[PDB]
Short mmCIF file of all heavy atoms in Angstrom, two decimals:
data_model
loop_
_atom_site.label_atom_id
_atom_site.label_comp_id
_atom_site.label_asym_id
_atom_site.label_seq_id
_atom_site.Cartn_x
_atom_site.Cartn_y
_atom_site.Cartn_z
N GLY A 1 -10.67 -161.75 140.31
CA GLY A 1 -9.51 -161.27 141.07
C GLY A 1 -9.44 -159.75 141.18
O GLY A 1 -8.69 -159.25 141.99
N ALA A 2 -10.17 -159.01 140.34
CA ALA A 2 -10.12 -157.54 140.36
C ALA A 2 -10.94 -156.95 141.51
O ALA A 2 -11.93 -157.51 141.98
CB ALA A 2 -10.62 -156.99 139.03
N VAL A 3 -10.58 -155.71 141.89
CA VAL A 3 -11.36 -154.97 142.89
C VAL A 3 -12.78 -154.68 142.39
O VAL A 3 -12.98 -154.11 141.30
CB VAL A 3 -10.60 -153.66 143.22
CG1 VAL A 3 -11.43 -152.78 144.14
CG2 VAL A 3 -9.23 -153.93 143.86
N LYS A 4 -13.76 -155.05 143.22
CA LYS A 4 -15.18 -154.83 142.94
C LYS A 4 -15.55 -153.38 143.29
O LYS A 4 -14.98 -152.79 144.22
CB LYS A 4 -16.11 -155.81 143.67
CG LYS A 4 -15.98 -157.26 143.24
CD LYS A 4 -16.79 -158.26 144.04
CE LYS A 4 -16.11 -158.65 145.31
NZ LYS A 4 -16.93 -159.68 145.95
N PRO A 5 -16.50 -152.76 142.56
CA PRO A 5 -17.06 -151.45 142.96
C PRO A 5 -17.89 -151.49 144.24
O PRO A 5 -18.47 -152.52 144.60
CB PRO A 5 -17.97 -151.07 141.77
CG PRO A 5 -17.56 -151.98 140.64
CD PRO A 5 -17.13 -153.28 141.35
N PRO A 6 -18.11 -150.33 144.91
CA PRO A 6 -19.12 -150.24 145.98
C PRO A 6 -20.51 -150.60 145.46
O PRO A 6 -20.75 -150.54 144.26
CB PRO A 6 -19.06 -148.75 146.41
CG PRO A 6 -17.71 -148.27 145.93
CD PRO A 6 -17.41 -149.06 144.66
N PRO A 7 -21.47 -150.99 146.33
CA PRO A 7 -22.85 -151.22 145.88
C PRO A 7 -23.47 -150.03 145.13
O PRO A 7 -23.22 -148.88 145.47
CB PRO A 7 -23.60 -151.55 147.19
CG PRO A 7 -22.69 -151.08 148.30
CD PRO A 7 -21.28 -151.20 147.78
N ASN A 8 -24.26 -150.35 144.11
CA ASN A 8 -24.93 -149.39 143.25
C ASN A 8 -23.93 -148.55 142.46
O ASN A 8 -24.36 -147.58 141.85
CB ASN A 8 -25.92 -148.52 144.01
CG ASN A 8 -26.86 -149.38 144.81
OD1 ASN A 8 -27.77 -150.00 144.27
ND2 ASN A 8 -26.60 -149.45 146.11
N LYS A 9 -22.64 -148.94 142.44
CA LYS A 9 -21.65 -148.27 141.60
C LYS A 9 -21.15 -149.21 140.50
O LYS A 9 -21.27 -150.43 140.58
CB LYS A 9 -20.42 -147.68 142.32
CG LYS A 9 -20.60 -146.75 143.53
CD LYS A 9 -21.49 -145.57 143.18
CE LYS A 9 -22.00 -144.75 144.36
NZ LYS A 9 -21.03 -143.71 144.72
N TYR A 10 -20.64 -148.58 139.41
CA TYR A 10 -20.14 -149.26 138.22
C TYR A 10 -18.68 -148.92 138.02
O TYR A 10 -18.22 -147.80 138.30
CB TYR A 10 -20.90 -148.87 136.92
CG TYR A 10 -22.35 -149.32 136.94
CD1 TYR A 10 -23.31 -148.56 137.62
CD2 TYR A 10 -22.74 -150.53 136.39
CE1 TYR A 10 -24.61 -149.01 137.76
CE2 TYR A 10 -24.06 -150.97 136.47
CZ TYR A 10 -24.99 -150.19 137.16
OH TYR A 10 -26.27 -150.59 137.35
N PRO A 11 -17.87 -149.85 137.46
CA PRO A 11 -16.49 -149.53 137.11
C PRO A 11 -16.49 -148.78 135.77
O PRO A 11 -16.91 -149.35 134.76
CB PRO A 11 -15.80 -150.91 136.96
CG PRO A 11 -16.92 -151.86 136.67
CD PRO A 11 -18.25 -151.24 137.15
N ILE A 12 -16.08 -147.51 135.83
CA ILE A 12 -16.07 -146.65 134.63
C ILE A 12 -14.65 -146.53 134.11
O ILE A 12 -13.77 -145.98 134.79
CB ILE A 12 -16.73 -145.28 134.89
CG1 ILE A 12 -18.12 -145.44 135.55
CG2 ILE A 12 -16.77 -144.44 133.60
CD1 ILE A 12 -19.06 -146.35 134.74
N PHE A 13 -14.44 -146.96 132.85
CA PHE A 13 -13.18 -146.70 132.18
C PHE A 13 -13.30 -145.46 131.30
O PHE A 13 -14.15 -145.39 130.40
CB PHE A 13 -12.79 -147.94 131.37
CG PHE A 13 -11.49 -147.77 130.58
CD1 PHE A 13 -10.26 -148.01 131.20
CD2 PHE A 13 -11.51 -147.34 129.25
CE1 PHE A 13 -9.08 -147.86 130.48
CE2 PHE A 13 -10.31 -147.23 128.54
CZ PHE A 13 -9.10 -147.48 129.17
N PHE A 14 -12.41 -144.50 131.55
CA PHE A 14 -12.44 -143.24 130.81
C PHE A 14 -11.50 -143.35 129.61
O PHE A 14 -10.31 -143.66 129.78
CB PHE A 14 -11.97 -142.12 131.76
CG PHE A 14 -12.97 -141.76 132.85
CD1 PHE A 14 -12.97 -142.42 134.08
CD2 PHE A 14 -13.96 -140.82 132.60
CE1 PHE A 14 -13.95 -142.11 135.03
CE2 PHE A 14 -14.89 -140.47 133.57
CZ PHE A 14 -14.89 -141.14 134.78
N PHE A 15 -12.05 -143.08 128.41
CA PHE A 15 -11.24 -143.13 127.20
C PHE A 15 -10.27 -141.95 127.24
O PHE A 15 -10.52 -140.91 127.86
CB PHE A 15 -12.12 -143.07 125.94
CG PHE A 15 -12.96 -144.32 125.73
CD1 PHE A 15 -14.35 -144.30 125.78
CD2 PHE A 15 -12.33 -145.53 125.46
CE1 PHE A 15 -15.10 -145.47 125.62
CE2 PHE A 15 -13.08 -146.70 125.29
CZ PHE A 15 -14.45 -146.67 125.35
N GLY A 16 -9.14 -142.12 126.59
CA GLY A 16 -8.14 -141.06 126.51
C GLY A 16 -7.18 -141.13 127.70
O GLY A 16 -5.98 -141.43 127.54
N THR A 17 -7.69 -140.79 128.90
CA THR A 17 -6.90 -140.90 130.12
C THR A 17 -6.60 -142.36 130.47
O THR A 17 -5.53 -142.65 131.05
CB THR A 17 -7.58 -140.15 131.26
OG1 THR A 17 -8.70 -140.97 131.59
CG2 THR A 17 -8.00 -138.74 130.91
N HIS A 18 -7.52 -143.30 130.17
CA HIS A 18 -7.38 -144.70 130.53
C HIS A 18 -7.41 -144.91 132.05
O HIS A 18 -6.90 -145.93 132.52
CB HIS A 18 -6.22 -145.43 129.82
CG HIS A 18 -6.11 -145.06 128.37
ND1 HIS A 18 -4.93 -144.64 127.80
CD2 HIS A 18 -7.05 -145.01 127.38
CE1 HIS A 18 -5.13 -144.36 126.51
NE2 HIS A 18 -6.39 -144.61 126.22
N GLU A 19 -8.07 -143.99 132.78
CA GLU A 19 -8.22 -144.11 134.22
C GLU A 19 -9.59 -144.73 134.53
O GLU A 19 -10.45 -144.73 133.67
CB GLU A 19 -8.16 -142.73 134.84
CG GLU A 19 -6.76 -142.15 134.72
CD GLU A 19 -6.69 -140.66 134.93
OE1 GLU A 19 -7.69 -140.02 135.33
OE2 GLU A 19 -5.59 -140.14 134.62
N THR A 20 -9.76 -145.24 135.76
CA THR A 20 -10.96 -145.92 136.19
C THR A 20 -11.48 -145.17 137.42
O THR A 20 -10.69 -144.76 138.27
CB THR A 20 -10.78 -147.40 136.55
OG1 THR A 20 -10.40 -148.15 135.39
CG2 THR A 20 -12.03 -148.01 137.17
N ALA A 21 -12.80 -145.02 137.51
CA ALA A 21 -13.44 -144.55 138.73
C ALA A 21 -14.75 -145.32 138.91
O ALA A 21 -15.24 -145.91 137.96
CB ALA A 21 -13.70 -143.08 138.64
N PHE A 22 -15.33 -145.26 140.12
CA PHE A 22 -16.58 -145.95 140.36
C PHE A 22 -17.67 -144.90 140.42
O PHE A 22 -17.59 -144.00 141.25
CB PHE A 22 -16.47 -146.75 141.66
CG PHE A 22 -15.42 -147.85 141.66
CD1 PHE A 22 -14.33 -147.80 142.52
CD2 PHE A 22 -15.56 -148.95 140.81
CE1 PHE A 22 -13.37 -148.82 142.51
CE2 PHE A 22 -14.61 -149.98 140.81
CZ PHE A 22 -13.51 -149.90 141.67
N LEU A 23 -18.70 -145.05 139.56
CA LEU A 23 -19.74 -144.03 139.51
C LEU A 23 -21.11 -144.69 139.51
O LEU A 23 -21.23 -145.83 139.12
CB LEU A 23 -19.64 -143.18 138.23
CG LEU A 23 -18.35 -142.36 138.11
CD1 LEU A 23 -18.55 -141.58 136.81
CD2 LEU A 23 -18.27 -141.40 139.26
N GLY A 24 -22.11 -143.93 140.00
CA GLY A 24 -23.49 -144.40 139.91
C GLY A 24 -24.21 -143.80 138.70
O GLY A 24 -23.74 -142.88 138.04
N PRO A 25 -25.38 -144.34 138.34
CA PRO A 25 -26.13 -143.92 137.16
C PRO A 25 -26.44 -142.43 137.02
O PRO A 25 -26.54 -141.96 135.90
CB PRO A 25 -27.40 -144.74 137.22
CG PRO A 25 -27.01 -145.93 138.06
CD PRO A 25 -25.99 -145.46 139.05
N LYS A 26 -26.51 -141.70 138.17
CA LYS A 26 -26.76 -140.28 138.06
C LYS A 26 -25.66 -139.55 137.27
O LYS A 26 -25.90 -138.48 136.73
CB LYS A 26 -26.91 -139.62 139.46
CG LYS A 26 -25.57 -139.37 140.15
CD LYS A 26 -25.66 -138.82 141.59
CE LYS A 26 -24.33 -138.51 142.26
NZ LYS A 26 -23.69 -137.29 141.76
N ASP A 27 -24.46 -140.16 137.17
CA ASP A 27 -23.38 -139.48 136.50
C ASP A 27 -23.08 -140.11 135.12
O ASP A 27 -22.05 -139.79 134.54
CB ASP A 27 -22.17 -139.47 137.42
CG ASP A 27 -22.35 -138.48 138.57
OD1 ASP A 27 -22.83 -137.37 138.30
OD2 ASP A 27 -21.94 -138.79 139.70
N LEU A 28 -23.98 -140.96 134.63
CA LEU A 28 -23.75 -141.76 133.42
C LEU A 28 -24.81 -141.39 132.38
O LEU A 28 -26.00 -141.66 132.54
CB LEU A 28 -23.77 -143.28 133.68
CG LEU A 28 -22.82 -143.75 134.78
CD1 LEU A 28 -23.00 -145.22 135.05
CD2 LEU A 28 -21.39 -143.37 134.46
N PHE A 29 -24.36 -140.79 131.26
CA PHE A 29 -25.22 -140.36 130.14
C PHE A 29 -24.98 -141.26 128.92
O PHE A 29 -23.89 -141.27 128.35
CB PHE A 29 -24.83 -138.92 129.80
CG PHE A 29 -25.18 -137.97 130.94
CD1 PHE A 29 -24.37 -137.87 132.09
CD2 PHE A 29 -26.30 -137.15 130.83
CE1 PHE A 29 -24.71 -136.99 133.13
CE2 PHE A 29 -26.62 -136.31 131.88
CZ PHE A 29 -25.85 -136.23 133.02
N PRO A 30 -25.97 -142.07 128.47
CA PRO A 30 -25.74 -142.95 127.32
C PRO A 30 -25.21 -142.22 126.10
O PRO A 30 -25.69 -141.14 125.74
CB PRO A 30 -27.17 -143.55 127.14
CG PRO A 30 -27.67 -143.72 128.58
CD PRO A 30 -27.22 -142.39 129.19
N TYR A 31 -24.23 -142.86 125.40
CA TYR A 31 -23.43 -142.20 124.38
C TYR A 31 -24.28 -141.75 123.18
O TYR A 31 -24.13 -140.61 122.76
CB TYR A 31 -22.31 -143.16 123.93
CG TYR A 31 -21.45 -142.58 122.80
CD1 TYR A 31 -20.58 -141.52 123.06
CD2 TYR A 31 -21.50 -143.10 121.52
CE1 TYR A 31 -19.79 -140.97 122.07
CE2 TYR A 31 -20.70 -142.58 120.51
CZ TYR A 31 -19.85 -141.53 120.80
OH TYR A 31 -19.12 -141.04 119.76
N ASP A 32 -25.19 -142.60 122.74
CA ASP A 32 -25.90 -142.31 121.48
C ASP A 32 -26.75 -141.06 121.68
O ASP A 32 -26.64 -140.09 120.90
CB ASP A 32 -26.61 -143.55 120.97
N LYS A 33 -27.54 -141.06 122.77
CA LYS A 33 -28.39 -139.92 123.13
C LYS A 33 -27.61 -138.62 123.34
O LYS A 33 -28.11 -137.53 123.00
CB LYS A 33 -29.33 -140.30 124.28
CG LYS A 33 -30.11 -139.12 124.90
CD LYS A 33 -31.03 -139.64 126.00
CE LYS A 33 -32.28 -138.84 126.01
NZ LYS A 33 -31.93 -137.52 126.51
N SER A 34 -26.37 -138.69 123.86
CA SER A 34 -25.68 -137.52 124.39
C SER A 34 -24.55 -136.99 123.50
O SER A 34 -23.99 -135.95 123.82
CB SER A 34 -25.11 -137.86 125.76
OG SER A 34 -26.19 -138.05 126.65
N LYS A 35 -24.17 -137.72 122.44
CA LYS A 35 -22.94 -137.38 121.74
C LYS A 35 -23.02 -136.03 121.03
O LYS A 35 -22.02 -135.32 120.92
CB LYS A 35 -22.45 -138.50 120.81
CG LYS A 35 -23.36 -138.87 119.69
CD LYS A 35 -22.59 -139.77 118.72
CE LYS A 35 -23.30 -139.92 117.42
NZ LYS A 35 -24.38 -140.90 117.53
N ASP A 36 -24.21 -135.67 120.53
CA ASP A 36 -24.34 -134.35 119.89
C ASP A 36 -23.92 -133.25 120.87
O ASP A 36 -23.17 -132.34 120.52
CB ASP A 36 -25.72 -134.10 119.31
CG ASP A 36 -25.98 -134.75 117.96
OD1 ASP A 36 -25.08 -135.46 117.48
OD2 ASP A 36 -27.08 -134.51 117.38
#
């Protein structure tokens, strides 16, 4: 029943703000690799 993202996009939930946006992999950095 929820709104689907555009093609090649993912539903991103932002911690803290609790807002959602649709983003592609170019803007997504895996947490373990990037947290430092």
Side-chain angles (χ1 to χ4, degrees), residues 1-31 33-36:
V3 174
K4 295 174 278 184
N8 308 285
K9 308 305 167 87
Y10 294 81
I12 309 305
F13 178 85
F14 288 89
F15 291 115
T17 72
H18 318 129
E19 292 163 8
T20 295
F22 297 117
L23 296 183
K26 79 185 183 74
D27 287 317
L28 306 175
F29 293 79
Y31 177 70
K33 171 179 215 289
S34 292
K35 62 168 194 281
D36 280 3

